[PDB]
Design an enzyme around this catalytic site. Structure first.
Site, PDB file in Angstrom:
ATOM      1  N   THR A  27       0.802  -1.232   0.000  1.00 62.61           N
ATOM      2  CA  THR A  27       0.000   0.000   0.000  1.00 62.61           C
ATOM      3  C   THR A  27       0.837   1.287   0.000  1.00 62.61           C
ATOM      4  O   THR A  27       1.807   1.411   0.741  1.00 62.61           O
ATOM      5  CB  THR A  27      -0.961   0.115   1.193  1.00 62.61           C
ATOM      6  OG1 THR A  27      -1.824  -1.004   1.087  1.00 62.61           O
ATOM      7  CG2 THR A  27      -1.811   1.373   1.190  1.00 62.61           C
ATOM      8  N   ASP A  65      -2.961   3.839  -4.018  1.00 61.91           N
ATOM      9  CA  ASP A  65      -2.855   2.763  -5.005  1.00 61.91           C
ATOM     10  C   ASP A  65      -4.049   1.786  -4.795  1.00 61.91           C
ATOM     11  O   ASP A  65      -4.911   2.049  -3.942  1.00 61.91           O
ATOM     12  CB  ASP A  65      -1.508   2.024  -4.912  1.00 61.91           C
ATOM     13  CG  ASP A  65      -1.471   1.007  -3.788  1.00 61.91           C
ATOM     14  OD1 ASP A  65      -1.797   1.396  -2.630  1.00 61.91           O
ATOM     15  OD2 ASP A  65      -1.183  -0.200  -4.049  1.00 61.91           O
ATOM     16  N   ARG A 100      -3.700  -1.991  -4.970  1.00 65.33           N
ATOM     17  CA  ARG A 100      -3.284  -3.367  -4.654  1.00 65.33           C
ATOM     18  C   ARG A 100      -3.546  -3.775  -3.222  1.00 65.33           C
ATOM     19  O   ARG A 100      -3.189  -3.070  -2.267  1.00 65.33           O
ATOM     20  CB  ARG A 100      -1.787  -3.549  -4.962  1.00 65.33           C
ATOM     21  CG  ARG A 100      -1.271  -4.975  -4.754  1.00 65.33           C
ATOM     22  CD  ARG A 100       0.208  -5.079  -5.135  1.00 65.33           C
ATOM     23  NE  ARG A 100       0.371  -5.028  -6.572  1.00 65.33           N
ATOM     24  CZ  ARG A 100       1.525  -5.251  -7.231  1.00 65.33           C
ATOM     25  NH1 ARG A 100       2.644  -5.555  -6.580  1.00 65.33           N
ATOM     26  NH2 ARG A 100       1.541  -5.205  -8.547  1.00 65.33           N
ATOM     27  N   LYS A 104      -9.130   2.246  -1.519  1.00 66.21           N
ATOM     28  CA  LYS A 104      -8.503   2.553  -0.241  1.00 66.21           C
ATOM     29  C   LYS A 104      -8.849   3.951   0.327  1.00 66.21           C
ATOM     30  O   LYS A 104      -8.430   4.277   1.425  1.00 66.21           O
ATOM     31  CB  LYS A 104      -7.004   2.409  -0.381  1.00 66.21           C
ATOM     32  CG  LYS A 104      -6.581   1.027  -0.812  1.00 66.21           C
ATOM     33  CD  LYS A 104      -5.074   0.869  -0.783  1.00 66.21           C
ATOM     34  CE  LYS A 104      -4.690  -0.389  -1.541  1.00 66.21           C
ATOM     35  NZ  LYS A 104      -3.227  -0.600  -1.503  1.00 66.21           N
ATOM     36  N   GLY A 164      -2.559  -0.929   6.100  1.00 63.55           N
ATOM     37  CA  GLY A 164      -2.393  -1.896   7.168  1.00 63.55           C
ATOM     38  C   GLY A 164      -3.332  -3.063   6.933  1.00 63.55           C
ATOM     39  O   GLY A 164      -3.470  -3.555   5.796  1.00 63.55           O
ATOM     40  N   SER A 194       3.567   0.504   2.934  1.00 63.59           N
ATOM     41  CA  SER A 194       4.894   0.011   2.561  1.00 63.59           C
ATOM     42  C   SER A 194       5.565   0.884   1.482  1.00 63.59           C
ATOM     43  O   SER A 194       6.789   0.860   1.374  1.00 63.59           O
ATOM     44  CB  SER A 194       4.864  -1.472   2.155  1.00 63.59           C
ATOM     45  OG  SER A 194       3.913  -1.668   1.103  1.00 63.59           O
ATOM     46  N   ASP A 243       7.768  -0.184  -4.669  1.00 60.08           N
ATOM     47  CA  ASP A 243       7.365  -1.043  -3.572  1.00 60.08           C
ATOM     48  C   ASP A 243       6.582  -2.242  -4.146  1.00 60.08           C
ATOM     49  O   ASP A 243       5.580  -2.095  -4.888  1.00 60.08           O
ATOM     50  CB  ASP A 243       6.500  -0.243  -2.557  1.00 60.08           C
ATOM     51  CG  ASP A 243       5.806  -1.127  -1.519  1.00 60.08           C
ATOM     52  OD1 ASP A 243       6.422  -2.080  -0.967  1.00 60.08           O
ATOM     53  OD2 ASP A 243       4.607  -0.856  -1.203  1.00 60.08           O
ATOM     54  N   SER A 286       2.778  -2.412  -3.481  1.00 57.22           N
ATOM     55  CA  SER A 286       1.906  -1.434  -4.093  1.00 57.22           C
ATOM     56  C   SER A 286       1.772  -1.681  -5.561  1.00 57.22           C
ATOM     57  O   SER A 286       2.697  -2.154  -6.204  1.00 57.22           O
ATOM     58  CB  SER A 286       2.417   0.016  -3.848  1.00 57.22           C
ATOM     59  OG  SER A 286       2.497   0.298  -2.454  1.00 57.22           O
TER      60      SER A 286
HETATM   61  C1  LIG Z   1      -1.627  -2.114   1.991  1.00 60.67           C
HETATM   62  O1  LIG Z   1      -1.403  -1.634   3.325  1.00 60.67           O
HETATM   63  C2  LIG Z   1      -2.968  -2.853   2.039  1.00 60.67           C
HETATM   64  C3  LIG Z   1      -4.141  -1.940   2.466  1.00 60.67           C
HETATM   65  C4  LIG Z   1      -5.494  -2.657   2.536  1.00 60.67           C
HETATM   66  C5  LIG Z   1      -6.539  -1.691   3.103  1.00 60.67           C
HETATM   67  C6  LIG Z   1      -5.916  -3.158   1.177  1.00 60.67           C
HETATM   68  N1  LIG Z   1      -2.857  -3.956   2.952  1.00 60.67           N
HETATM   69  C7  LIG Z   1      -3.058  -5.226   2.599  1.00 60.67           C
HETATM   70  O2  LIG Z   1      -3.295  -5.655   1.478  1.00 60.67           O
HETATM   71  C8  LIG Z   1      -2.912  -6.190   3.733  1.00 60.67           C
HETATM   72  C9  LIG Z   1      -1.394  -6.260   3.969  1.00 60.67           C
HETATM   73  O3  LIG Z   1      -1.289  -7.415   4.801  1.00 60.67           O
HETATM   74  N2  LIG Z   1      -3.591  -7.463   3.501  1.00 60.67           N
HETATM   75  C10 LIG Z   1      -4.678  -7.867   4.193  1.00 60.67           C
HETATM   76  O4  LIG Z   1      -5.208  -7.255   5.149  1.00 60.67           O
HETATM   77  C11 LIG Z   1      -5.251  -9.230   3.870  1.00 60.67           C
HETATM   78  C12 LIG Z   1      -6.594  -9.045   3.233  1.00 60.67           C
HETATM   79  C13 LIG Z   1      -6.370  -8.816   1.742  1.00 60.67           C
HETATM   80  C14 LIG Z   1      -7.355  -9.602   0.887  1.00 60.67           C
HETATM   81  C15 LIG Z   1      -8.632  -8.900   0.417  1.00 60.67           C
HETATM   82  C16 LIG Z   1      -9.888  -9.635   0.918  1.00 60.67           C
HETATM   83  C17 LIG Z   1      -8.682  -7.414   0.857  1.00 60.67           C
HETATM   84  C18 LIG Z   1      -0.385  -2.958   1.531  1.00 60.67           C
HETATM   85  C19 LIG Z   1       0.871  -2.042   1.251  1.00 60.67           C
HETATM   86  O5  LIG Z   1       0.016  -3.865   2.573  1.00 60.67           O
HETATM   87  C20 LIG Z   1      -0.657  -3.862   0.309  1.00 60.67           C
HETATM   88  O6  LIG Z   1       0.477  -4.713   0.043  1.00 60.67           O
END
Ligand SMILES: *[C@@](O)([C@H](CC(C)C)NC(=O)[C@H](CO)NC(=O)CCCCC(C)C)[C@@](C)(O)CO
Ligand SMILES: [Cl-]
Ligand SMILES: [Cl-]
Ligand SMILES: [Cl-]
Ligand SMILES: [Cl-]
Ligand SMILES: [Cl-]
Ligand SMILES: [Cl-]
Ligand SMILES: [Cl-]
Ligand SMILES: [Cl-]
Ligand SMILES: [Cl-]
Ligand SMILES: [Cl-]
Ligand SMILES: [Cl-]
Ligand SMILES: [Cl-]
Ligand SMILES: [Cl-]
Ligand SMILES: [Cl-]
Ligand SMILES: [Cl-]
Ligand SMILES: [Mg+2]
Ligand SMILES: [Mg+2]
Ligand SMILES: [Mg+2]
Lengths: 237, 233, 230, 234, 220, 196, 248, 204
Positions: free
Chosen positions: E1, E17, E19, E33, E47, E129, E166, E169
């Site tokens: 993120t 972003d 992802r 997001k 997070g 990240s 990153d 992202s």
């Molecule tokens: C982001 O922080 C991203 C933000 C989130 C609000 C989409 N975080 C995630 O993707 C986290 C990182 O562990 N993943 C989850 O909470 C698992 C659930 C994801 C699966 C879907 C049902 C949402 C980044 C920088 O961490 C993304 O890499």
């Protein structure tokens, strides 16, 4: 939570709620018990008849466990609460003692439940008396009665509900070694006792038996009217 | 209508006074303390020949050295009796000794005024107990008889009657009691008195009798042992 | 502590008189009107507004519950504020779980259930209010009333408060199924004029409307416009 | 009338009838007397026997080595209060390793007994106490009431016909401070004897005695042990 | 993120972003997001995804109750307080890292809010990240009082820095522009990443898959 | 260590269980019974941690019997299996989890025979045959090899005996005797123990 | 506070529970509601009280509630109280299904709710619920069933019964016309309309003023339907045609 | 890993006016197969199904507790639940256990009960929702499943082509996973019918 003292003493030592609970029992359908030699029998009046009733759904005789049953007179909703509490307790006893309850054990339990509802805040007494029957481990037949006060005693035979006074009088004169020498006569003794007070005899006696080890058999109207004729034609002689 | 913890102008709790009046609706019981043991005797009050007389239990064992006779609203007595039993077993568990008769009586008597409707748990006691009790037993003080009523007052007595005919019976007890009286005399005296005061003709099935002696544990008299004592009386 | 016994009980004839008496507080309240048009709903009410000293804008009788649901009442104002607060909270609790605005009928059922509680629960009286609740969902308008018992009803048009019996017959001889929202606003204000006494201004009536775009109060200037014809 | 069933209801005269009624429980108990000298505090109690064959009710109770009480009124309330006192004394020895001062214990009673006089559905305590104690400030006699008031006393009597005892105690109280123990107990007995019908006398069956002082832990004398004190009422 | 925000002359620009990852695998290519708080307040989340969704939803809901009561447009400080007090109470166990921006009666306001409950009120912030990549862009190029289009360019540049540098992202750039007069929720703003095209066709005809059992249940 | 097995045929379910209660290096009982009668046509076979096993099974048993007394008729096998499962799963994340593995066998008037398998996590599976314990590793393939859905009750007892003989040959534990029961339209029947 | 407590859960001198009796007077005044059991199904028919011209019509019924897949009920008495109980019925039914993975048998659902009603007569110092209910259902133990419960927490099973306004008269008419073991849904429907026609004696009977629901079994599944107004008017027509035959 | 104790795989896929949901059929405990007909896909409506992979006990508990909630919802509301609303209900149920979660990650597949528009989503074990316009996957072979779906899925597929695509995506994915397979079940959901098939599949 509601904590009002409901059952209290009055001048002269009366507990009016308990006396009024006993008035409720006296307006219930008559119920009778006799302790045989190796059978116990319960019979109960009526209540309404009514052709459109499903008969199964209003029985006043109830299994507590395999070796114990009961009849009641009084408030039928109250009785259902007491019966279910006693059924739970029979399963705890089996769980922790690994024997079925004695009839005296479950009687003593029901009686102390009733007594507690005459001495606890926020509750009225149960408006029921019960006749409790069955057999102990060693084959001994038993008949107990409880009332709304929580008092209980064992009986050779007894009646509760409306007309209990006169049914008890009849039993006092008619309960002898001869009248219970067999199973058929024990059953008849109960039917005769009812057929005194029973409005449009009868018709609306519900009846059940328990034999040593043999679990509760309720009689059907065809099996009842066999006994009714078998006593009625004998009373002409 | 007033609350259950209301004082009268004479300084008494209405509920307690009324509970004391309920004791007078009970069957008569008698206790006598002698140097050879205590006896407890009670009128059964059979109301139908269809009732099983052995199912009336107005004298009970508390422990091996302590019995209890009751009069009044008998259903009320069950929780008091169970508290007495549990307390003597707790005392044995904790201290490896028998509890005194006085101590048992005290423990039970501390339940007496624990009723009321806005201090306590969701469904605590709503009223006092309509019961009087005679505790008879033997401990290192020797034989002992204690009386307790619904006020939670308890006291040692040389002889005491309770229930319907207790006036009457108490008067005959003053007449016959003496400190050097034997147990066998005390047993006879209490059956003579029950015989006077009972509405029914006394016999071996409509009374109960028990003793506790320095030698011997709590003992309920059998039908056959009652018949023996009844012959003279 | 709180009294734990019911203050509403059955009389020998089978009436819950505290509820009847709560309805008499409603009947003596200021008039309210609701009309379901084909394309929306109007809610209107009279202010029991004496003085020129009142800041008419400082408290409202016609209130939003959500973007798409609104309320008015007849009876006791402070009781109403309780129900407004609970209705808003009920609507948000629904939204958090389902992620969809609460359907009007679902909101009415939950609010009516709160009113029922106060007819049975310990140490309390019933609410001295009846609510008229409007909303739009599934492409369609809704008008409901909820009474002090917790009974609710769906209406095409109705009246409550002072002179309501007459107001209902006035609407009976005047509402039609195919009526538009702008016409409905006019007949709602005429229904209030039947029992007004005072001369109507935009400052002593309050009007709310509900359509596909959502629920909102009409502004003083918009009400003034409708009042020119009346 | 409408004002006499609840401890929470003030009467229009500024009284609480339930508290006054509770005080009648003490006036009807059997009499007890308390008095003190420079060195000792004494309690003397008449015991009522139900019948000729009953023991006679305990009136004097041990609280701690330095404190004992005499009771009048509801016995069950007396035990509840005595158990509270005992526990407060045990707590003080546990925490501080010293006896609870008598005046502090009496304050705790005042505070405990006041609480139910102000809450609906509660009742006053129906017991009055005479409290004998000895601490760093010397001997004490205190009196407690169902009103939750308490009093620090040169001497006192409560219970039935206690007015006579109080009159004797006023008459002789200028002598008490200088009395030896025997003289002081004799004075207690003569006061108590004023409460009796003219026929009847103090006996070993009806008198109970409690004593505490500088050299003496709280001790109860009953039955044959009261005879030394009764002989020589000459 | 990668999430970020800036205060410009007349408002706030928020960026993110799209992802979402599970471990080192992309689970969502087009996650949203930038979350609604109120009509004048939005919040980017980084997070733990369930925690950012649920936390912003709850606060948005409590804020709607607040505004319904007050009859006024909510304040950014109020959202900030509500978020930080809840996150503090949970001691960092709610893994929501937030960029909160809006415009209220006192003008534009931007806050970063951390999982343990600290907040920083600043004219530019980044989280996720990708946050150091995005912050490098801001430190190099931010000026006070930018015009709307400059601010939008800067935020998307910053998000792009995170997207490309990153591994956490990726995919699209979303922006939200908030002023006194306007709310522009621009999803997507830019789509700098595109799946390549398929070169061979795998259109499997009926009967390619062997079937053991079949049941047709007709419906109304 | 404890072995349970069940084999369901067209109109019956056959079940067996070892009769050993062990502790450390010793058998402490050789006539142990691991089967609990729930109702006229239901057996629950329970193994696992000491205390948990009996406590759990007897609680289920008392409640199944209570249901009969309250209602006048019995729970079906499937209802009893789901009841058992709800209780185990509800305890899984509580302060009082029960570490037990089970088979539930029954016969329903209308649905016929049923055998259910449950692990300590409370996953519930209906199966034509099943087994629990380390002994299952050596016997499930013998069942896969020779079981057919129309298997007669004689042949089921033969198939059972092949499984039990395989434990004697190949298993490191001394499990010399097994309880055997069958359930059908006429209730629960005790068969002879199979012993070595 | 003892002065204000009306003591809803105590006995009167004759062993009566006054609040229960008074709640039963409330029920007697509410809309008439009948149930009739047949060989191929069960029905509920109820007088509507929501009949003013300006009402809107938004739900599929006024007083008929679905409880679960296999059961429905109707109510007579305080409506808000009925909404509480029917919500509780639905909960009980889902708690059972969760636990056993089969539908709650009809009598077990009725009994569970009756135990709640009973509690309200025995402790807690609250007013009882002012509701009587008719329950229709199918289960695998007793097939098609009809139950009745009242504010005492008492219930019974019936082949046919009535609650609410003119109950006594309705039951007499059922006693005389109901054929034990021989009724069909089509003849139970005819009898329901006959009975309502006599007991809504203020005044002439109309489809706008009644509500009918049927419960049947089709292809191993329970079907619960509220009859449309077209069908209700047709049955009223047939009853009126039938009374033209009554003499010659 | 808790999620691989039982193994298992589910996926869902969108076509024109239809959706598909598929699951493997193994119930096993680590290496040991216990059964080959274990249900993982559950009806939540005539045209709305939920598939759950993860710990078998939680697959069953979540399906059951969700059904409790849905039944109450439908009785209280006038109506059948919308797909998006089911997703939310499930999210709420999972997030209630945020600090001691159910170990299951569902997929939902259905048609809107009024408009018949296709819907698919998945959620993580604490209830984070993800809606997509193509496919979703959950289970111990998610990487295998992503590789098949990304390569084979095309937009606007008719029911027959949708069936072939989801079937080939499932069979070939689980054939690279030791603890998933022992059979595949596929439901195709259309406006006017449901078609349920079991596939000829490897049994090792
Ligand atoms: C982001 O922080 C991203 C933000 C989130 C609000 C989409 N975080 C995630 O993707 C986290 C990182 O562990 N993943 C989850 O909470 C698992 C659930 C994801 C699966 C879907 C049902 C949402 C980044 C920088 O961490 C993304 O890499
Ligand atoms: Cl209890
Ligand atoms: Cl009687
Ligand atoms: Cl007495
Ligand atoms: Cl209260
Ligand atoms: Cl509000
Ligand atoms: Cl909303
Ligand atoms: Cl507005
Ligand atoms: Cl005294
Ligand atoms: Cl006293
Ligand atoms: Cl004073
Ligand atoms: Cl005094
Ligand atoms: Cl702040
Ligand atoms: Cl259902
Ligand atoms: Cl169901
Ligand atoms: Cl749940
Ligand atoms: Mg453990
Ligand atoms: Mg595989
Ligand atoms: Mg393999």
């Amino acid at each position: 939570s509601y904590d009002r003292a409901i059952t209290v003493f009055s001048p002269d030592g009366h507990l009016f709620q308990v006396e009024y609970a006993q008035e409720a029992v006296k307006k219930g359908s008559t119920a009778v018990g006799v302790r045989g030699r190796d059978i116990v029998v319960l019979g109960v009046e009526k209540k309404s008849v009514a052709k459109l009733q499903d008969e199964r759904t209003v029985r006043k005789i109830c299994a507590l466990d395999d070796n114990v049953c009961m009849a009641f007179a009084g408030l039928t909703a109250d009785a259902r609460i007491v019966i279910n509490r006693a059924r739970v307790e029979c399963q705890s006893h089996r769980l922790t003692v690994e024997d079925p309850v004695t009839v005296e054990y479950i009687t003593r339990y029901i009686a102390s439940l009733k007594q507690r509802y005459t001495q606890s805040n926020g509750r009225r007494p149960f408006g029921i008396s019960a006749l409790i029957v069955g057999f102990d481990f060693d084959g001994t037949p038993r008949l107990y009665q409880t009332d709304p006060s929580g008092t209980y005693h064992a009986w050779k035979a007894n009646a509760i509900g409306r007309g209990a006074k006169s049914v008890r009088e009849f039993l006092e004169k008619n309960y002898t070694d001869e009248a219970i020498e067999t199973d058929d006569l024990t059953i008849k003794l109960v039917i005769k006792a009812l057929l005194e007070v029973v409005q449009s005899g009868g018709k609306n006696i519900e009846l059940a038996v328990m034999r040593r080890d043999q679990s509760l058999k309720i009689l059907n109207p065809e099996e009842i009217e066999k006994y009714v004729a078998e006593i009625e034609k004998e009373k002409e002689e | 209508d007033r609350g259950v913890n209301t004082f009268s102008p004479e300084g008494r709790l209405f509920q307690v006074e009324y509970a004391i009046e309920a004791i007078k609706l009970g069957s008569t019981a008698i206790g006598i303390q002698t140097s050879e043991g205590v006896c407890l005797a009670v009128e059964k009050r059979i109301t139908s020949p269809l009732m099983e007389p052995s199912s009336i239990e107005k004298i009970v064992e508390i422990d091996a050295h302590i019995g209890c006779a009751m009069s009044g609203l008998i259903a009320d007595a069950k929780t008091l009796i169970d508290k007495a039993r549990v307390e003597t077993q707790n005392h044995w568990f904790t201290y490896n000794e028998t509890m005194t008769v006085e101590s048992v009586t005290q423990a039970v008597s501390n339940l007496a005024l624990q009723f009321g409707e806005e201090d306590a748990d969701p469904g605590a006691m709503s009223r006092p107990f309509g019961v009087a009790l005679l505790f008879g037993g033997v401990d290192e003080k020797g034989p002992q008889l204690f009386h307790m009523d619904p006020s939670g007052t308890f006291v040692q007595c040389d002889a005491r009657a309770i229930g319907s005919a207790s006036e009457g019976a108490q008067s005959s007890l003053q007449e016959v009691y003496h400190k050097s009286m034997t147990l066998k005399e005390a047993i006879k005296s209490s059956l003579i008195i029950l015989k006077q005061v009972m509405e029914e003709k006394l016999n071996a099935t409509n009374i109960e009798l028990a003793t506790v002696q320095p030698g011997q544990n709590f003992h309920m008299f059998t039908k056959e042992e009652l018949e023996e004592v009844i012959k003279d009386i | 502590r709180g009294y734990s016994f019911s203050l509403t009980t059955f009389s020998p004839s089978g009436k819950l008189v505290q509820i009847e008496y709560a309805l008499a507080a409603v009947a003596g309240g200021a008039p309210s009107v609701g009309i379901k048009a084909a394309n929306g709903v109007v809610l209107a009410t009279e202010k029991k507004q004496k003085s020129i000293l009142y800041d008419e804008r400082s408290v409202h009788k016609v209130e939003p519950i959500t973007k798409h649901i609104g309320l008015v009442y007849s009876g006791m104002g402070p009781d109403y504020r309780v129900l407004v607060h609970r209705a808003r909270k009920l609507a948000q609790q629904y939204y958090l779980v389902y992620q969809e605005p609460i359907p009007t009928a679902q909101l009415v059922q939950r609010v009516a259930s709160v009113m029922q509680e106060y007819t049975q629960s310990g140490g309390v009286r019933p609410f001295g209010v009846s609510l008229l609740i409007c909303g739009w969902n599934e492409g369609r308008p809704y008008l409901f009333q909820s009474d002090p018992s917790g009974a609710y009803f769906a209406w095409k048009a109705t009246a409550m408060g002072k002179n309501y019996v007459n107001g209902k017959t006035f609407l009976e001889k005047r509402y039609n199924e195919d009526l538009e929202l702008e016409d409905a606003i006019h007949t709602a204000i005429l229904t209030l004029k039947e029992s007004f006494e005072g001369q109507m201004t935009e400052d002593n009536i309050e009007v709310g409307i509900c359509n596909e775009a959502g629920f909102r109060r009409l502004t003083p200037t918009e009400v003034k416009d409708y009042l020119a014809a009346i | 009338n409408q004002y006499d069933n609840d401890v929470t209801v003030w009467s229009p005269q500024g009284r609480i009838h339930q508290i006054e009624y509770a005080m009648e429980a003490v006036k009807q108990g059997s009499a007890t007397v308390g008095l003190k000298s420079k060195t000792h505090a004494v309690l003397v109690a008449l015991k009522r026997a139900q019948s000729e064959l009953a023991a006679h009710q305990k009136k004097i109770l041990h609280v701690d080595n330095h404190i004992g009480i005499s009771i009048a009124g509801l016995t069950a309330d007396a035990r509840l209060l005595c158990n509270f006192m005992r526990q407060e004394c045990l707590d003080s020895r546990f925490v501080f390793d010293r006896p609870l001062p008598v005046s502090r214990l009496v304050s705790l009673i005042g505070s405990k007994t006041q609480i139910p006089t102000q809450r609906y559905g509660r009742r006053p305590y129906g017991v009055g106490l005479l409290i004998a104690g000895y601490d760093d400030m010397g001997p004490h006699i205190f009196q407690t009431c169902p009103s939750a008031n308490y009093f620090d006393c040169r001497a006192m009597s409560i219970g039935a016909r206690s007015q006579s005892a109080r009159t004797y105690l006023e008459r002789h109280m200028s002598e008490f401070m200088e009395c030896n123990l025997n003289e002081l107990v004799k004075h207690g007995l003569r006061a108590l004897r004023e409460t009796l019908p003219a026929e009847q006398d103090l006996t070993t069956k009806n008198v109970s005695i409690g004593i505490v002082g500088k050299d003496l832990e709280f001790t109860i004398y009953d039955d044959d042990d009261v005879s030394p004190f009764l002989e020589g009422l000459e | 993120t990668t999430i970020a925000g800036v205060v410009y002359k007349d408002g706030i620009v928020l960026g993110a972003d799209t992802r979402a990852t599970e471990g080192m695998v992309v689970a969502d290519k087009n996650c949203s997001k930038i979350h609604f708080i109120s009509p004048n307040i939005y919040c980017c989340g980084a997070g733990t995804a369930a925690d950012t969704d649920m936390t912003t939803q709850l606060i948005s809901s409590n804020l709607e109750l607040h505004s319904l009561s007050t009859g006024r447009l909510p304040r950014v400080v109020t959202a900030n307080r509500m978020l930080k007090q809840m996150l503090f109470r949970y001691q960092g166990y709610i893994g929501a890292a937030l960029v909160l921006g809006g415009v209220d009666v006192t003008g534009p306001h931007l806050y970063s809010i951390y999982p343990h409950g600290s907040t920083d009120k600043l004219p530019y912030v980044t989280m996720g990240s990708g946050s150091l990549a995005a912050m490098a862009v801001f430190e190099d190029k931010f000026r006070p009082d930018m015009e709307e289009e400059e601010a939008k360019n800067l935020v998307s540049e910053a998000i792009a820095a995170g997207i490309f540098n990153d591994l956490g992202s990726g995919s699209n750039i979303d922006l939200c522009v908030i002023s006194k007069n306007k709310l522009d929720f621009l999803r997507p703003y830019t789509v700098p990443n595109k799946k390549g095209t398929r070169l061979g066709r795998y259109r499997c005809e009926k009967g390619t898959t062997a079937v053991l059992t079949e049941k047709i249940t007709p419906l109304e | 260590m404890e072995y349970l097995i069940g084999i369901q045929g067209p109109d019956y379910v056959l079940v067996a269980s070892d009769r050993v209660a062990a502790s450390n290096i010793v058998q402490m009982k050789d006539d142990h019974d691991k089967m609990f009668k729930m109702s006229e046509k239901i057996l629950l076979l329970c193994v696992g941690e000491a205390g948990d096993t009996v406590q759990f099974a007897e609680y289920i048993q008392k409640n199944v019997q209570l249901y009969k007394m309250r209602n006048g008729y019995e729970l079906s096998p499937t209802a009893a299996a789901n009841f058992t499962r709800r209780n185990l799963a509800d305890c899984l994340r509580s302060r009082t989890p029960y570490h037990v593995n089970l088979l539930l066998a029954g016969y329903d008037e209308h649905e016929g025979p049923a055998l259910y398998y449950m692990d300590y996590l409370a996953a519930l599976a209906k199966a034509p045959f099943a087994a629990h314990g380390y002994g299952a590793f050596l016997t499930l393939s013998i069942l896969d090899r020779y079981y057919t859905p129309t298997i007669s009750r004689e042949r089921a007892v033969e198939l059972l005996r092949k499984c039990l003989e395989e434990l004697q040959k190949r298993f490191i534990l001394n499990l010399p005797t097994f309880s055997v029961r069958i359930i059908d339209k006429n209730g629960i029947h005790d068969l002879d123990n199979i012993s070595f | 506070s003892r002065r204000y407590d009306s003591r809803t859960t105590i006995f009167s001198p004759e062993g009566r529970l006054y609040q229960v009796e008074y709640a039963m007077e409330a029920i007697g005044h509410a809309g008439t509601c009948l149930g009739i059991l047949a060989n191929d199904g069960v029905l509920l028919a109820a007088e509507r009280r929501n009949i003013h011209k300006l009402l809107d019509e938004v739900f599929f019924s006024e007083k008929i509630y679905k409880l679960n897949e296999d059961m429905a009920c109707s109510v007579a008495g305080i409506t808000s109280d009925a909404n509480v109980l029917t919500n509780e019925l639905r909960l009980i039914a889902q708690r059972y299904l969760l636990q056993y993975q089969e539908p709650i048998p009809c009598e077990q659902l009725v009994t569970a709710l009756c135990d709640i009603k009973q509690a309200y007569t025995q402790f807690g110092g609250k007013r009882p619920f002012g509701v009587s209910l008719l329950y229709i259902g199918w289960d695998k133990h007793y097939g098609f069933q009809l139950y009745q419960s009242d504010p005492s927490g008492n219930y019974g099973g019936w082949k046919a019964t009535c609650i609410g306004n003119n109950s006594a008269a309705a039951v007499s008419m059922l006693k005389q016309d109901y054929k034990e073991g021989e009724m069909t849904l089509k003849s139970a429907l005819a009898l329901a309309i006959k009975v309502l026609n006599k007991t809504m004696d203020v005044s002439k009977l109309s489809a706008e003023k009644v509500e009918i629901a049927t419960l049947t079994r089709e292809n191993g599944k329970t079907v619960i339907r509220v009859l449309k107004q077209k069908e209700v008017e047709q049955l009223i027509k047939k009853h009126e045609e039938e009374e033209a035959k009554a003499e010659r | 890993s808790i999620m691989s104790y039982n193994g298992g795989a589910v996926m869902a896929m969108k076509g024109k006016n239809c959706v598909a949901i598929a699951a493997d059929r193994r119930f096993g405990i680590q290496a040991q197969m216990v059964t080959t007909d274990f249900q993982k896909i559950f009806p939540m409506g005539d045209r709305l199904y939920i598939g759950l992979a993860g710990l078998a006990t939680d697959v069953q508990t979540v399906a059951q507790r969700l059904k409790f909630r849905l039944n109450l919802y439908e009785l209280k509301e006038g109506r059948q639940i919308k797909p998006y609303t089911l997703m939310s209900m499930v999210a709420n149920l999972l997030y209630e256990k945020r600090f001691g979660p159910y170990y299951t990650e569902p997929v939902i597949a259905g048609l809107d009960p009024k408009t018949f528009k296709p819907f698919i989503c998945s959620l993580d074990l604490i209830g984070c929702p993800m809606v997509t316009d193509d496919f979703v996957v959950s289970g111990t072979c998610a990487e295998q499943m992503y590789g098949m779906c990304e390569s084979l899925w095309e937009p606007n597929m008719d029911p027959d082509h949708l069936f072939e695509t989801i079937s080939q995506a499932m069979l070939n994915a689980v054939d690279r996973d030791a603890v998933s397979g022992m059979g595949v079940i596929v439901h195709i959901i259309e406006k006017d019918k449901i078609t349920t098939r079991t596939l000829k599949a490897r049994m090792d």
